C-alpha cells in the first residue's frame, strides 16, 4: 500500500529525516559562529534560497526558450528569459552586442562548455598558472606531465605566470609565450590574483597571435556588476563566470558572448551565440536546473540594486583595511596591497608554510586556505562573506588582530616543537592559548547578523 | 550611499524581494498540479527533499572528498556527504566492500561524462544504444551528415547499436557483431525510451568477448532498481551511473557507482575504479560540490529505502502496464507490444500521425507527453507513469488517463482529416475548438482530485 | 692522408667489399634457380636497374619541378616531369583531369601521405579487412584493440569484409557499415583479393555516406596499365600505387589525384593537387630519391609498350591456367577462380594450415606466403614474377604439378607425425622425397631466361 | 601479339631502352663534376655503393626483421641486413649489448617519424631546434599564422627552441626554461644549419630535469661522428636517428639507433626501445624494406670504418674552417663567427643582400649554395664542404672556392647598386653579363682539375 502523499511528500524535513535536519542545523551554527575568509565563499539571501528550494526542480526543459524539445515550459521560459535579461542588465550590456546562456550547472561546466563551443579537441589554450594565481579549469598538468584538468586532457594548455619578484602578471613574458606557442584561446581572470587585469593588453596580445580572448570573472563578478573593477566586457570575446562568489547568488555559471557586427579589423559578425548555446545543450548538459535559474534571476535583480553597489565598494575597502592592518604589523602581501576582494599573504618571510597557519586558524573557526605565491608559502584571505554579514572597516581591522594572534601562536608552536609538520601537530593538542582565541572568535562572530535564515529560530 | 541592512536584503522573503519570480513560481506550481504530467523523466519530489535543497548548504565550498578536502570548515559537510554515500549503497543493496559511489556529479550528463573521463583516454571507442532506438545523447550521437552532436562523440569515438527493426527489442546478435568489428573500450546499456528490461548478463557476455568495460546508465529506472522491481545492473556491470531526479524521486543530481575489491578471474588483482572516478569528478571536471543537492539527495535516498517507496515502484509499473493494456485495447500500437518498466512507447505511424501533432494538441489540454522516435519526424510519443503515480494515481486512474489520451488522438485525427496533413493546415484546427476546451477542462477536473507533494495546495497563490 | 678518389670512389664493388659482392651474387642465383610465386614480387629490367644505380642518388632536390628550394635541378626537373607525364600516359589519363606525384619512397608512404592530405588526425577510414584480403596500410587493429597500422594509430579505421561463404566483397554489408560508421575515406583495393573490383559500386556507396574514395592498386597496377582489369580512375578521387609489383618497375609509390572541374553533383573544382603535393613535401618526406624517379620513368615507358600489354594478358592467363590446374586436382580456390594476377588456395578442406605448406615449399625453392581466407588456412600464389621470366600456360601448369607434389608430401608428413607444428617439423629433417622435388624445381627453373642481369656472367 | 623476349626488354642496356633518360642522366653526370657543389647535405658516393644500389636486391620482398620474416626465401637478405646492422654499430663504436640499430627507414624523415611513433602517443609534446635557428622540418614546424606544416606538428604537439639572438649559439638557459613550462615527452637535438657542436651532456641534464626522452638526429654530421671528430651523441642520448647520404657518404637511407640493456639509476630495469622501434618501422609505418639500399648502406658503413674515411672527415672540417677564415678575412660575417663542423653559415644582411640574390647568381656560375635563415627573406646562405672534399679538395682549393664566392658576391652587389634592390630590378643584371661568364668559366676550369667518385669521367657521353 502506497504512503499517502501527505505522509512522505508534504511532511517537513525535521520529521522525514532528523539526521540530515540536525546536520544542516549544525552547519547553520558553524556558518555564523566563525569567521569565514575563503575568498570564493559568500552568504546568499533568503529569497535566493526560496527560489532554490522550489517546485522548479521538478521540471524538465531541455533546450532553451522558444526552442524546447517538449511542452509545458510556458512559465520556465519567462523565468529563463527574465534571468537572461537581468544578467545583461547587471553588467550594463547592450543586448544587440551581448548574449548570455544561464544554463551551466556551475563554474567549471561553464568554462568547459565555452571551450567546447569555440575550440576543437587538442587546440592550444593559455591560462594563468595555478601557482601564479590561476584556476584548475584554465589548464593544469604536473611536473611529471600528468594531465589533471580536463582542459589539459582534452585540449593542450600552457600557463603564463606572474613576475617572479613583483607578483604582477608578466605581460611581456605573456606576449612572448603566446607567439612561440600560438594558442587559439587565451584565458584571463583568476582565483588568487590580488590586482586588477589589463584587459586592453590581453586584447593587444590576442590580436597579435590570432587568439580568442576569454575572461573568467568568477571571483570578481560582483565587483564588475558594481563597476568597481575593470570591465572585461570591453575587450574580451567571451566572459564566463560563477554566480555564487562575489555575486552572492546560487551556485551556477553563466557564459556571456559577443553578438552583432565585428569592430572593423571584412564586414562580418560574431558567430558565438549558436555555438555557445549548442555546446551547453545538446552537447554537454542535460535538462537545465530550473530552480538554480530562478534563484539566479533573484540574485541578478538583487545585484543590480543601489544597496549592492555599496556592498561591492565595502568589500574592496574591507580587504584594503585588513591589508593595511597586516602590513602595519610587518607582514608581507603579494604585490603589497590589493585592488579587489582578497589579499594574498606571503608567509615565507616568517619561515612558515600556508598549511600550518590554515590548520591553526581552522582550529579557531577562522577558515582560510593555503595558497601558492609567485609547500604553499601563503594564505588567501577574502572579504565578501564577512562583508555580507555587515562587517565594515573597524571590524576587518579586528579580524586582522585575530589573524595576527593566530600567526604568533603558530610561530610560538614552531619555535617550540620544530619546522616539520609532524612536530607542529604536537603543539596543537590541548593548547590553552588556541582555546582562548577560539572563544574570542566565537564571541566576535556572534555580534553580527546573518542572511539566508533567521538566527532567532535555529535549533542551536 | 550605505549598505543595505542584512534583514532587508538577506532575510526578507522571496515574495517581497522579487514579486516577478515569486509570481512565476506560483504560476508554475499551478501548472504542475492542474494538468497531467506524463514525461517519463519527470517526478514530483518530497517537501523534505526541497527543504534540504533550499538550505544554507549552498554557501559552503568543499572541493575534494570527505576526509581529504582542500580547506577546512567541512566537519558537517563530510558527515552529510558520507551519510549520503552510505545511503546510496543501502538503497541499491550493495556490499560496501564490493561497491563505492561518488555523489558529486551536478547532474546525469556530468556523471556520465565524468565516468568516461575516468576510464577512457580521449578518442577511445564507445558503444551505446542509438538515439533513434531509445538511447541517450550522452551515450554518443552524430547525425547522418557526419555532425558530431554529443560531447561523447566529440571527445571520444562512438558507434551506436540498434533495436530489431521489426520487434523493437535490442538486437543482441547485432550488438555482438558490431562490438567485435569496432572493439569499443566501453559498452553502455540503459536508455531514455526503451520499454523493456535489459539483459545485463548478455551485455556482460559481449563485453567479456570483445574486452570492453560495461557501464549501465540507469537514470530512468533507478527507482525501479532501488525497489528490486527490474533486473539489477550491479550483478554484471563494472560502473553504474545514474540520475537521481527521475523514478528515484530525488533532487536533480547524479551518482557514479564503481566496483571495488577483488575480481573473479590477472592474479588476485583488484578493481582500480575508485581513484580514477573520484579524481575525474574532482579535480578534473567539477569544482566545488553542490552541497544542498547532496543533502537533498541524502534525504531522497533514505526515503527511497522505505517500504512505501517499494510500493510506489510497484505501482508505477502496474500503472504503466494498465495504461498500455488500455491503449492497445482501443486498437493502438506500442513498441514491443507493451512494457516492463515505467513507460510506454506509442507508435503513431499506424494512424498516419506524427508525434509532433499529438504532443502539440495534448499540451493544449494540459497533458504533457513528448514526441519520440520509434525503431524506424518522430513517429511516436513517449509516456511515463512516475510523476502521476507520485500523486496517488492507481490503475483505475491511469485507465482514465488512457481515456483522455484516446480523446486527444481522436481530436487530432478529426483535425487532420478536416484541415490536412500539412502542419500549416493542422494548426488551423486548434483555434477556438470547444471540443478541445471540454477536454482541457475534463483534464483539469480529474487533476484536482489528487494530492501533490513538495508544497501545500492549500497555501498556493493561484487556486 | 686521404685515399685517392680512384681507390675508394671508383673501385668496383667486387673489390671494395667482397662480402657484400658475394651475398648479392648468391641472391642472384637464388632468384633464378627457384620458383618465385610471391604475388607482390616481380623481376625488373636491366635498364630500370641502371637508372636505379646512377649518379642521380647524389642530388638533393627538395620541393618539386619549378618550385625547388635551391638550384642545380635543371636536369632532375626534366626527369621528374618526364616521369609524371609517362605516369599519366601509362594509365590513359587526360592531364587536365588527373595529376600524379611520383616522390613517395614506396607504397606505404604513398598511402600515408594521401591520408595526410585529405584527412585530419582521427578521421574515420574504412578499408578491406586484412583477413578478407586487405593491406596493413588500410587499417588494422587486433582483437585486443592494439593499434598496429599507423593508419589505425593516427586515424580511426573500421574494416569491411568479404562474404563469409562466397569470398567476394560483401557490397551490402559494406554499405551498411559505411552508414553506421560514416567514414571520411573509403579505401578499395587489396593484397590477396583474387577478383576484380566494382568501383562503380564503391562510388555508389561513397556518395551515399559523403566519403572520399581512394583505390590502392599496388598489386594490379600493371594489369590496369594494359586495360586488363577495371580502371579505378573512372570512379575514384585518388589512386595510390606501388611501382614494383605487376608494374615491374623500381620500389616506389605514386599518388594520382583528380584535377579540373567536378562532375556536376555547385560549379566547383577538385582541390586535391596542392594538398597531395604538400603532404608529400614538406609535410612527410625529405628529398626525393631521384635515382628511384629516373628508374620509374624507365619503367613507365616500358609499361606503355605493346610488349607489356602482352605481358599483362599473359600474367592473367598463367594464373587462370594454374588455377584450373589445381581445381582439376580437387583443390579449393577462394571464389573458385581468378580474374587477376593471383590465386588464393584454401587449405582447410585438406586439413592443412598455410604455415605448413609454405615451409615445405620454401624447402624446395618454391616461395609462396601463408595468407588468410574469409592459423591462416591458405596460401597466396601469384603469376607476375615467373611470367616476366617468360613462362607461359604449359609452364604454369607444370608449376601446378610442383605445388600438387608439395601438398601431397605435406599431407604424407602430417599423416605420419601429427597435426601440431612441433610434429610437422619432425618430418622435414633429411626427407629424401623433399630433396627429389628441390632438384626437380632447380632443373625446371634453369630452363628460363632472367631479366635484370646476365645469367651468363654471374659468379655462380 | 606476343610477349617481348626477356633479352629484349629485360637485359638490354638503359642507353637503348630509353635514350631520353640515359641522355638526362649523362647531362646530370656532367653538371655534378663541371661545377662546385656546396650544398651541405650533398655528397658523392662511391661506385661500390652505387653497384649495390643498382642490383637485383630490388626484387626481393622481405617484410619483417632478420630471423622473423613474413615469408621465406630470405637466406641471403638476412645476412646482408645483419651485416649492415653489425657494421652500423662498428662505424660508431657502440657496444652491441648497449645499442641496437634498425636500418630499414627509407630515408631520414621516415626514420624520424618512425622513431616518434615508437616512443610517443599521438599529440605528445616534442621540442626541437627551431627552423629559423638551424633546425629541421621533421623536428616540428608551424608558421606564425598557425599553419601546421611538418608532419611532426600535425600528429604531435611541437614547440621550438632557439639560438641566442645575438651570438647564434643554442640558448641552453632558455631551452631549460621552455622544457620546464611545456614538459615535452621528447627533446630533439641536431640540425641542418647549425655551425657549432652540441652539448649533449647539457641536453641530457635538461631532459633529466623535465623527464623527457632525448633523441639526437645526427644526419648532417654522421660522417664526422663515425670518425670521432665531433661530440658523440651516444654518450647521452636514448635514441639517435640519422640519414646515411650526407657526411656519411652512403646511399639515401636512414637508421635508428636505440639504447638497450641496463640503465644506470626503477630497480634493475632495462631499456625497452628495441621492440617498439622495429615494430614502428614494420609493420606500423613501412612495407617491404628496400634491400638494394640496405646493401649499398652496408658498403658505405664498411668504407666509413676505413682509415681513409677518418682522414676524409678531418679534411672536411679543415676545409670548412679554411673557407670560413678566408671569408672572414675578406670582411664577411659568419653566424657564431666560424665553424666546428662541416659547414659555414654566412650572414649576408650586413651587405644588404638576401640569400635569394646570392644563391641565384651563384647557380649561374655553377656554384650551388642554398639560401638559409639566420638567428633573426632568408638573410644568409649555407655552405658545406663534404661534397667537394670527396673530390679531393684540400685547404688551398677551398680558399680558391672562397675566392670564387667573393667574386660572386661582388658581382651581386655591383648588380644591386646598378639596377636596385627589387628582385625585378636584380634580374636585369644577369642577362649577357660577360663578367659572370668569365666566372662561370673560371669555375668550370677549376672544377675539372679534380677527380670524381661514382662513375668514370673517361666514360661519360658529354666531355
Ligand atoms: C538515460 C539518461 N541518462 C542520463 C540523462 C541525463 O540527465 P541530466 O539531464 O541530469 O543531465 C538522461 C536525461 N533524461 C532526459 C529524458 O529522458 O527526458 C537520460 O534519459
Ligand atoms: C576563477 C575561477 N573560475 C571558476 C571556478 C569554478 O567554480 P565551480 O566550483 O562552480 O565549478 C573557480 C572556483 N573557485 C574555487 C576557489 O577559489 O576556492 C574559480 O576560482
Ligand atoms: C638534420 C636533418 N635530419 C633529417 C633530414 C631528412 O633527410 P631525408 O631527406 O632523407 O628525409 C635532413 C634533410 N637534410 C636536408 C638539408 O639539410 O638540405 C636533415 O637536414
Ligand atoms: C595492396 C598494397 N598496397 C600497398 C602495399 C605497400 O607496399 P610497400 O612495401 O612498397 O610499402 C602493399 C604491399 N604488398 C606486400 C605483399 O602483398 O606481399 C600492398 O599489397
Cell of A3: 504512503
To test the contact with chain D by mutation, choose from A155, A161, A181, A183 the residue with the greatest count of D C-beta atoms within 10 A, namely: A181
**DSSP code of A8?**
I
- Check CB contact under 8 Å for B9 and A453: no
Cell of B290: 553542490
Q: Which of D417, D437, D441, D444 is nearest to D428 (CA)?
A: D417
Residues D294 and D384 in one domain: no
CATH code (residue C110): 3.40.640.10
What b-and-e string marks burial along D332-368, b requiring 16 or more CB atoms within 10 Å of the CB?
bbbbbeebbbbbbbbbbeebebbbbbbbbbbbbbbbb
A311's CB contacts (< 8 A; 6+ apart) are: A222, A226, A248, A387, A388, B3, B4
Residues A336 and A245 in one domain: no
**Residues pairing with C379 in the sheet:** C345, C370
Residues B330 and B250 in one domain: no
Residues D281 and D329 in one domain: no
| Cα nearest neighbour of A294 on chain B | B21
Q: Is residue A288 part of a domain?
A: yes
- Dist CA A104 CA A253 (whole Å): 5
- Decide: C399 and C359 in contact? Cβ < 8 Å: no
Q: Is residue B15 part of a domain?
A: no
- Dist CA D122 CA D129 (whole Å): 20
- Dist CA D370 CA D376 (whole Å): 17
Ligand 4 neighbourhood includes D285 CB (under 6 angstroms): no
D131's CB contacts (< 8 A; 6+ apart) are: D137, D139, D141, D160, D373
What b-and-e string marks burial along C25-55, b requiring 16 or more CB atoms within 10 Å of the CB?
bbbbebbbbbbbbbbbbbbbbbbbbbbbbbb
- Dist CA C130 CA C122 (whole Å): 20
Residues A292 and A268 in one domain: yes
Q: Is residue A23 part of a domain?
A: no
C268's CB contacts (< 8 A; 6+ apart) are: C261, C262
Around Cβ B128, how many Cβ atoms within 10 Å? 30
Is residue A220 helix, strand or coil?
A: coil
- Decide: B160 and B133 in contact? Cβ < 8 Å: yes
Backbone phi and psi for residue B55, each to the nearest 5 degrees, phi listed first: -145, 175
Residues A287 and A322 in one domain: no
Q: Which of C135, C381, C384 to mutate to test the pocket of ligand 4 (most atoms within 8 A of CB)?
A: C135
Q: Which of B195, B177, B201 is nearest to B127 (CA)?
A: B177
- Dist CA A410 CA A401 (whole Å): 14
**Residues pairing with C187 in the sheet:** C214
Q: Is residue D17 part of a domain?
A: no
> Which atom of ligand 3 sits closest to the CA of residue D39?
18
From the list A2, A121, A358, the residue facing B122 with the nearest CB is A121
Paired sense of beta strands A369-371 and A63-64, if any: unpaired
- Dist CA B389 CA A187 (whole Å): 49
C446's CB contacts (< 8 A; 6+ apart) are: C32, C33
Q: Is residue D136 part of a domain?
A: yes
Around Cβ C67, how many Cβ atoms within 10 Å? 9
Q: Where would I find the beta strands (DSSP E) of A222-301? A: 238-242, 253-258
To test the contact with chain D by mutation, choose from A142, A180, A211 the residue with the greatest count of D C-beta atoms within 10 A, namely: A180
Cα–Cα–Cα angle for A430, A436, A441, rounded to 5 degrees: 120
Q: Which of C193, C219, C249 to mutate to test the pocket of ligand 4 (most atoms within 8 A of CB)?
A: C219
- Decide: C183 and C158 in contact? Cβ < 8 Å: yes
Residues C218 and C319 in one domain: no
Is residue A131 helix, strand or coil?
A: coil
DSSP collapsed to 3 states, chain C: CCCCHHHHHHCCHHHHCHHHHHHHHHHHHHHHCCEECCCCCCCCCHHHHHHHCCHHHHCCCCEECCEECCCCCHHHHHHHHHHHHHHHHHCCCCCCCEEEECCCCCHHHHHHHHHHHHCCCCCEEEEECCCCCCCHHHCCECCCCCECCHHHHHCEEEEECECCCCCCECHHHHHHHHHHHCCCEEEECCCCCCCCCCHHHHHHHHHHHCCEEEEECCCCHHHHHCCCCCCHHHCCCEEEEECCCCCCCCCCEEEEEECCECCCCCCCECCCHHHHHHHHHHHHCCCCCHHHHHHHHHHHHHHCCHHHHHHHHHHHHHHHHHHHHHHHCCCEEHHHCCCCCEEEEECHHHCCCHHHHHHHHHHCCEECEEECCCCCCEEEEECHHHHHCCCCHHHHHHHHHHHHHHHHHHHHHHHHHCCCHHHHHHCCCCCHHHHHHHHHHHHHHCCCCCCCCCHHHCCC
From ligand 4's centre to the CA of C135, what distance in Å? 7
**Residues pairing with B101 in the sheet:** B257
- Dist CA C64 CA C77 (whole Å): 8
Q: Which of B233, B310, B244 is nearest to B105 (CA)?
A: B244
- Decide: B218 and B297 in contact? Cβ < 8 Å: no
Count the domains in chain C. 2
Cell of D302: 664498411
Q: Which of A387, A253, A369, A244 is nearest to A315 (CA)?
A: A387
Query: How many residues in total does chain C contain?
Result: 460
Residues A111 and A165 in one domain: yes
Residues B394 and B435 in one domain: yes
**Distance between B136 CA and the closest CA of chain A, angstroms:** 10
**DSSP code of B148?**
B
Looking at D272, D303, D334, the residue that finishes a domain is D303
Around Cβ A454, how many Cβ atoms within 10 Å? 10
- Dist CA A281 CA A64 (whole Å): 8
Note down the domain range covering C326.
311-457
Looking at B246, B279, B303, the residue that finishes a domain is B303
Burial of C442 per CB tally in 10 Å (0-12, 13-18, 19+): middle
- Dist CA A3 CA C451 (whole Å): 95
Q: How far is CA B312 from CA B121, B396, C176, in A?
A: 41, 15, 44
Category of C5 on φ-ψ map: left (φ > 0), alpha (ψ -120 to 50) or beta: alpha
- Dist CA A24 CA B249 (whole Å): 21
DSSP string, D359-403: HHHHHTTTEE-EEE-------EEEEE-HHHHHTT--HHHHHHHHH
Category of D439 on φ-ψ map: left (φ > 0), alpha (ψ -120 to 50) or beta: alpha
Cell 582489369 sits at which residue? C229
Q: Is residue D8 part of a domain?
A: no
- Dist CA A29 CA B289 (whole Å): 20
- Dist CA D211 CA B434 (whole Å): 78
Q: Kindly list the strands in the beta sheet with B343-347, ordered across the sheet, starting from the edge strand earlier in the chain.
A: B333-334, B343-347, B380-384, B370-372
Residues C70 and C100 in one domain: yes
Backbone phi and psi for residue A2, each to the nearest 5 degrees, phi listed first: -70, 145
Q: Is residue D199 part of a domain?
A: yes
Looking at A274, A303, A332, the residue that finishes a domain is A303
Residues 233-272, chain A: which have Cβ within 8 Å of B? Answer: 244, 250-251
**Residues pairing with D128 in the sheet:** D160
Displacement of CA C288 from its chain's centroid (Å): 21
D458's CB contacts (< 8 A; 6+ apart) are: none
Is residue A222 helix, strand or coil?
A: helix
Is residue B274 helix, strand or coil?
A: helix
Paired sense of beta strands A238-242 and A212-216, if any: parallel
- Dist CA C91 CA C228 (whole Å): 11
CATH code (residue C428): 3.90.1150.10
Cα–Cα–Cα angle for A355, B62, B82, rounded to 5 degrees: 110
- Decide: C48 and C299 in contact? Cβ < 8 Å: yes
**DSSP code of B283?**
I
B160's CB contacts (< 8 A; 6+ apart) are: B127, B128, B129, B130, B131, B133, B135, B139, B140, B141, C180
Sequence-separated contacts (24+) of A171-174 with Cβ below 8 Å: A171/A198, A171/A201, A171/A205, A174/A126, A174/A202, A174/A205
- Dist CA D255 CA D251 (whole Å): 12
Q: Which of C279, C283, A177 is nearest to D142 (CA)?
A: C283
A298's CB contacts (< 8 A; 6+ apart) are: A45, A47, A48, A51, A249, B14, B17, B18, B21
Residues C293 and C321 in one domain: no
Is residue A226 helix, strand or coil?
A: coil
Residues B102 and B226 in one domain: yes
- Decide: A455 and A387 in contact? Cβ < 8 Å: no
Q: Which of D75, D48, D115, D41 is nearest to D286 (CA)?
A: D115
Q: Which of D44, D225, B271, B71 is nearest to C5 (CA)?
A: D44
> Which atom of ligand 1 sits closest to the CA of residue B107?
10
Residues of D in contact with A173 (CB under 8 A): none
Q: Is residue D115 part of a domain?
A: yes
Amino acid at each position: 500500500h502506497m504512503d499517502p502523499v501527505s505522509v512522505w511528500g508534504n511532511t517537513p524535513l525535521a520529521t522525514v529525516d532528523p539526521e540530515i535536519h540536525d546536520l544542516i542545523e549544525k552547519e547553520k551554527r558553524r556558518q555564523c559562529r566563525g569567521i569565514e575568509l575563503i575568498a570564493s565563499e559568500n552568504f546568499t539571501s533568503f529569497a535566493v534560497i526560496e527560489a532554490l528550494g522550489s517546485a522548479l526542480t521538478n521540471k524538465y526543459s531541455e533546450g532553451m526558450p522558444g526552442n524546447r524539445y517538449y511542452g509545458g515550459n510556458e512559465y520556465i521560459d519567462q523565468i529563463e528569459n527574465l534571468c537572461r535579461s537581468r544578467a545583461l542588465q547587471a553588467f550594463h550590456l547592450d543586448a544587440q552586442s551581448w548574449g548570455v546562456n544561464v544554463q551551466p550547472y556551475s563554474g567549471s561546466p561553464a568554462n568547459f562548455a565555452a571551450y567546447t563551443a569555440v575550440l576543437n579537441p587538442h587546440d592550444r589554450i593559455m591560462g594563468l598558472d595555478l601557482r601564479s594565481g590561476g584556476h584548475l579549469t584554465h589548464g593544469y598538468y604536473t611536473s611529471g606531465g600528468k594531465k589533471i584538468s580536463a582542459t589539459s586532457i582534452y585540449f593542450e594548455s600552457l600557463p603564463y605566470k606572474v613576475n617572479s619578484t613583483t607578483g604582477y602578471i608578466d605581460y611581456d613574458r605573456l606576449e612572448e609565450k603566446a607567439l612561440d606557442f600560438r594558442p587559439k584561446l587565451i584565458i584571463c581572470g583568476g582565483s588568487a590574483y590580488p590586482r586588477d587585469w589589463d584587459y586592453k593588453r590581453f586584447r593587444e596580445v590576442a590580436d597579435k597571435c590570432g587568439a580568442l580572448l576569454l575572461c573568467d570573472m568568477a571571483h570578481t563578478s560582483g565587483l564588475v556588476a558594481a563597476q568597481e573593477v575593470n570591465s572585461p566586457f570591453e575587450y574580451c570575446d567571451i566572459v564566463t563566470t560563477t554566480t555564487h562568489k562575489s555575486l552572492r547568488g546560487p551556485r551556477a555559471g553563466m557564459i556571456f558572448y559577443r553578438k552583432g557586427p565585428k569592430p572593423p579589423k571584412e564586414n562580418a559578425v560574431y558567430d558565438f551565440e549558436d555555438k555557445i548555446n549548442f555546446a551547453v545543450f545538446p552537447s554537454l548538459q542535460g535538462g537545465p536546473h530550473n530552480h538554480q535559474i530562478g534563484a539566479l534571476a533573484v540574485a541578478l535583480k538583487q545585484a543590480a540594486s543601489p544597496g549592492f553597489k555599496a556592498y561591492a565598494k565595502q568589500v574592496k575597502a574591507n580587504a584594503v583595511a585588513l591589508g593595511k592592518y597586516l602590513m602595519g604589523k610587518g607582514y608581507s602581501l603579494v604585490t603589497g596591497g590589493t585592488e579587489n576582494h582578497l589579499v594574498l599573504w606571503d608567509l615565507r618571510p616568517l619561515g612558515l608554510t600556508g598549511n600550518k597557519v590554515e590548520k591553526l586558524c581552522d582550529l579557531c573557526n577562522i577558515t582560510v586556505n593555503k595558497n601558492a605565491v609567485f609547500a604553499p608559502g601563503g594564505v588567501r584571505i577574502g572579504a565578501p562573506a564577512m562583508t555580507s554579514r555587515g562587517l565594515v572597516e573597524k571590524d576587518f581591522e579586528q579580524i586582522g588582530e585575530f589573524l595576527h594572534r593566530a600567526v604568533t601562536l603558530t610561530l610560538e608552536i614552531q619555535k617550540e616543537h620544530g619546522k616539520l609538520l609532524k612536530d607542529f601537530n604536537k603543539g596543537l593538542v590541548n593548547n590553552k592559548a588556541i582555546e582562548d582565541l577560539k572563544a574570542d572568535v566565537e564571541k566576535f562572530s556572534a555580534l553580527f547578523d546573518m542572511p539566508g535564515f533567521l538566527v532567532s529560530e535555529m535549533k542551536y
